[PDB]
TrEMBL record, chain A:
Belongs to the peptidase M16 family. UQCRC1/QCR1 subfamily. Component of the ubiquinol-cytochrome c oxidoreductase (cytochrome b-c1 complex, complex III, CIII), a multisubunit enzyme composed of 11 subunits. The complex is composed of 3 respiratory subunits cytochrome b, cytochrome c1 and Rieske protein UQCRFS1, 2 core protein subunits UQCRC1/QCR1 and UQCRC2/QCR2, and 6 low-molecular weight protein subunits UQCRH/QCR6, UQCRB/QCR7, UQCRQ/QCR8, UQCR10/QCR9, UQCR11/QCR10 and subunit 9, the cleavage product of Rieske protein UQCRFS1. This is Cytochrome b-c1 complex subunit 1, mitochondrial. It comes from Gallus gallus (Chicken). It is found in: Mitochondrion inner membrane. It comes from the Eukaryota.
UniProtKB/TrEMBL annotation, chain B:
Gene3D superfamilies: Cytochrome b-c1 complex subunit 8. It is found in: Mitochondrion inner membrane. Its main location: mitochondrion. Belongs to the UQCRQ/QCR8 family. Component of the ubiquinol-cytochrome c oxidoreductase, a multisubunit transmembrane complex that is part of the mitochondrial electron transport chain which drives oxidative phosphorylation. The complex plays an important role in the uptake of multiple carbon sources present in different host niches. This is Cytochrome b-c1 complex subunit 8.
């Protein structure tokens, strides 16, 4: 963001962001195991606060 | 008023879960019943004793009283 040309930017990437992937697994954005919500409570008591 | 002026408490964490995320009467066998027994056991000998000791006194005095109503032939073997 700023005064930059998408072009001149996209190019620099091509140049320093090389390392191309061979297998398909490298192009695989892994899906994360769901996190379960739990109605509960945690009470940290310190009357000295 | 009464909550907040109670006592000085430090470093104690407590965790609990919404009643809807847990069981109303959990581990009836594995945990529940065993403790019911444990407790029964613990007290049985402090309680039961004097109760039983009374029961006797009851039964004794209760029957001994009946015995005092029946007649003793040894009062009439004299006629």
């Amino acid at each position: 963001a700023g005064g930059i040309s998408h072009k001149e930017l996209v190019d620099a990437a091509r140049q320093h962001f090389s390392g191309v992937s061979f297998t398909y697994k490298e192009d695989a954005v892994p899906i994360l195991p769901r996190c379960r919500f739990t109605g509960s409570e945690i009470r940290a008591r310190d009357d000295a606060l | 008023i009464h909550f907040g002026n109670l006592a000085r408490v430090r470093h104690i964490i407590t965790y609990s879960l919404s009643p809807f995320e847990q069981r109303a009467i959990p581990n009836i066998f594995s945990d529940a019943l065993p403790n019911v027994w444990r407790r029964f056991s613990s007290q049985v000998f402090k309680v039961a004793p004097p109760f039983l000791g009374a029961y006797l006194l009851y039964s004794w005095g209760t029957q001994e009283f009946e015995r005092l109503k029946r007649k003793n032939p040894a009062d009439y073997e004299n006629d």
